[PDB]
Amino acid sequence: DEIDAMALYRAWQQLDNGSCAQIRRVSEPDELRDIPAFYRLVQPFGWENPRHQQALLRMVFCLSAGKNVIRHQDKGISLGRALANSGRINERRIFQLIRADRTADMVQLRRLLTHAEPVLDWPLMARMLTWWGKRERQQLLEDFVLTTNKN
Amino acid sequence: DEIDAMALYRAWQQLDNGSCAQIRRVSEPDELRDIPAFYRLVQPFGWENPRHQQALLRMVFCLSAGKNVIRHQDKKTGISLGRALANSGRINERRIFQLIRADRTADMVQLRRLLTHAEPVLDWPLMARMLTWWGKRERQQLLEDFVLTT
Amino acid sequence: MRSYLILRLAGPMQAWGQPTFEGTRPTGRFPTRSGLLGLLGACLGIQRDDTSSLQALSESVQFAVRCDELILDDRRVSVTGLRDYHTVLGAREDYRGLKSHETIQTWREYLCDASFTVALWLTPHATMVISELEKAVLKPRYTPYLGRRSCPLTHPLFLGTCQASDPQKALLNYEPVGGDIYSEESVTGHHLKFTARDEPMITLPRQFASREWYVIKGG
Amino acid sequence: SNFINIHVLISHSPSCLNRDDMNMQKDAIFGGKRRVRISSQSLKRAMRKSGYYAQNIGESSLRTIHLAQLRDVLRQKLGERFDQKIIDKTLALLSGSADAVTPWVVGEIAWFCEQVAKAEADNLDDKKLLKVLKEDIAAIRVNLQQGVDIALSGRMATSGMMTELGKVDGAMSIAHAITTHQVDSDIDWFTAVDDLQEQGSAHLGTQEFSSGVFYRYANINLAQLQENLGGASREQALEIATHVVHMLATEVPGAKQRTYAAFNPADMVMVNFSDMPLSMANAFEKAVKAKDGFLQPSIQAFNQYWDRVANGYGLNGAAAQFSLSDVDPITAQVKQMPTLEQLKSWVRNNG
Amino acid sequence: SNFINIHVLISHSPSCLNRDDMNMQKDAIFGGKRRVRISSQSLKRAMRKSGYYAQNIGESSLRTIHLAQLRDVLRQKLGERFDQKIIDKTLALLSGKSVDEAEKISADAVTPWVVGEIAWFCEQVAKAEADNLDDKKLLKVLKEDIAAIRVNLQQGVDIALSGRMATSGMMTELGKVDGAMSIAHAITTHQVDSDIDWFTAVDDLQEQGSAHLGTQEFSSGVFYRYANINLAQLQENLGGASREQALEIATHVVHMLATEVPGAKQRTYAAFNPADMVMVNFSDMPLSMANAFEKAVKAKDGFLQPSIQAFNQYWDRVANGYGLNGAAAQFSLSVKQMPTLEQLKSWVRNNG
DNA sequence: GCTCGATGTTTTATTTATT
DNA sequence: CTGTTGGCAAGCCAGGATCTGAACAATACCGTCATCGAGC
Known part of the structure; x- marks a missing residue:
């Protein structure tokens, strides 16, 4: 019972310019529940199932930073290692992500993605966005601090 | 392969006031995962390798008791932790029992409290090995050292 | 070349006897000759009073025991010993009647993590054939056990x-x-000998005469 | 097949169901790790002295053995060593159309025949003979009214049996019960408070105790059971076997039970037929690690083990598995049972 | 049915109701996870010393090893019924110890005594030496009829429920009682990592800091109490009581097991919580439900709801699998639905 | 057929470490 | 039927001391050799 992350990535990359343009326009993830093209995208990924649908909200909202923002690589590079590898993010901003409340965290993450334009392993990040909670924030900070401090 | 415990000791010793102050206010070992200064401290000592992770959590907690609470003193085996705690003459035996009988995370809290009280003089790499393993044998040994010394 | 029948004696606990007339029932490191004759004798339908076929089996078969160290996850597990405090309530006080003791005590030794591989062949003047012994160990009549x-x-x-x-x-x-092999037949580059008293005196029920294994070490 | 294999996984709450001369839990090293143990003798006694056993095995129908009906086959069997005078005299003094006969009966009666022959040779009889052999006769009589108990569990500790043929092994064999996992036992530091002592208690002590998921194994020699029941049928033997299954699934030693009360039933019972009886204890040679309990991983490990080795070990043959859990099942070669009773009936009908 | 099975699910707020040699909470490994434990002896003594027990069942026995103090007590209590000599000799016959005027006379071990039972016994001793009957023959005669002595156990029911042994004296032959009931240690249905209380004792003559700094282990818990009464044995141990009396006693055991909680650290933690769930069941042979919690109950809007649910599910699995159909009543509050504990108690009183 | 009681014999080795 | 791109994301400096960590009482008993002849 897991969302095929790579399939969703491909679905987004192949999606018509119009629909994805409609999706990027959203300001916060909940607003995605008012866009038709959204459902049209996340329908073959079990949007009917609630847990899957919160997960999907986050995943799509991160995928809507741009279409060439998140260059999916493949072993795997975590989000922390990626944002650290960009060299464009300072630690205080990562803190400003992991301390942010509901919805706001996703916005800050979107801005961080636009800013860093990270090369990462997407399915890993998808798993992270699914269990978005104290453990993933923690390991995010861990990866970021380590990768930064090695340089 | 094995954690350079003295290097970690000196590292902790010449750490800036800030990072140190951040590591100190932790209230249980796992919380050290929230402090960036911790990662920057233990990264050269093999943190990105899991076994080392657990060991280092214990070590850095015990050190987080304070910069001047664990006095390293070279070998003339060397002063074991139990011996040190007894040598302080401040620690009641019953507390040592309660320590060696305790369970995970609680044991480290109680140990840090004991260390804070005794301010022990000991062979630090030795205690570091002990913390690395920390099986039931090590805890019994702690208790028996403490008893034989008094 | 002769025909051999290869057996395997594995299980969590085993018990292979040493001389005793007491509540203590001791164990050896490897299967005893009488114990093996008893295992085979149990596979066949031999009763305890059938001294004839008992002696036929005894004079038809010779053994070779190898001790197999248990390896688990690439790690070796050594054979340990076990002492069982085995009490008996209402045990017979005498060999006839119905008088009994409230409680009696025994102490019985087992082997833990032990497993053996037995090689079996026929004496030059044997009665049976390894075929029927094979049939026996494939479809035993009495329940076979390890001691x-x-x-x-x-x-x-x-x-x-x-x-x-x-x-x-x-x-x-x-x-x-x-594994170390203890055999009833010598082997060229090996001369060691392991004395034991497990050759079942049959004509004298439950008695034991002396004999010797040929000890052959493994590399 | 000739053998019935009975495998049981049963989980016990904190208790001390079997100890040694130091009041320490019985254990055993398996796969290099310590398992808590319930000795074979304790388990088998727990069965043999149980009320269920007494009702279904003790008060059985084939219980009583009538020396009368056994006259002819005895007359030939012993007829080669004794003549009919001594045989009939013996039979009649013991008692005061059968096809076959239980071997221990033949043996003990033969001994009695030796005794009465030597009684006639020396010139003697009357209450002399009936006082020399009073206790012996009493014994053989009490045993003659317990045929099923003797066939299944073997002769009692104090039986009265006198011949090599009167060394009656039970038909059932019960292995020691061992836990499927490593166990470091707990300690209970208890006090005994005196109602007449102001300061402190009157006694202090410790008691070792532990939980544990146990693996009981037992097998039944059907042929030997029939033969020890005077040539009974396979079906009757299967009824007895049914009872053995029930007891091995429900009976628990009474040791320390008044105070720890581990009255737990089996969570899994499997029965399978084979020509060679085998224990599935090697399913737990690598000690089972706990994942949401020790029970589910134990059953799972049992199933996986069976799936792996059953074919090669020649365990092909009838096999049924009653279970309370919903863990992924065995190979489809094993017939699943939803109630214990359906399993027992599966056993009654020869599998 | 012969067996009365009592199951209790009871939640306790933070507390420390049972500790060991080092004042830490008693625990027990179950299903690979640590459970907090309340020992069975603690529960039994908590029950037998309760006000409810005193009002409804009677006087708890007198458990002691100090035979001198006991001598004095009996003299003070059985003085106007017997002469001191007889009392002394009776104690000396039951204990196997010489009862003189020593300051300290110690028995073989801590042993439960019933004052009434002792009274009956010294009646027998009086009538024994009066008829010039020595001690051995007296032992034989008394050995011929034990039921009477067990009616003297009607005067000390906790011995009839929990049992008694003696290694010395005539008690060895006459006082051997196998407990009627049977009871398990209370273990939590979930894993517990016990909290630690860092406390200080403030000195009113010490301005600087505190006079004591210490730690105290404690925790919250959803405990599973189990206890079955053997019944026929309860009738035997009471001298041949009726089934009604045994059923009523069992009812009291249900009430207590449902409501009584050890007083340990309750003056500073006060976990005076009643059982949220109680279930009683008649059966042919004992059945514990602890394996409902072999897999530790994971929290879900509390530990209590998933515990009760898990209990019910396992109960159904067992009942369906083993085909158990003994009468059963559950009282719940969160097989029967028992709006009140009282209805469940009367239901038990009336043989189910 | 027992339970009773006196009775054949014989014991002591230590005492501060570190996977 | 059709939805875009570039360019850019900061630095300084700072995390404390005082003083304190308990006592008492209690750790069981039985049986798991044998003999003989006597009284019962």
């Missing part, structure tokens, strides 16, 4: 059959190789 009835088998008694020069080569055909 004591409370010791089940975790691996089928039958391991295989083959032909060969000496028992050591026959046993070489079957993993795990390297």
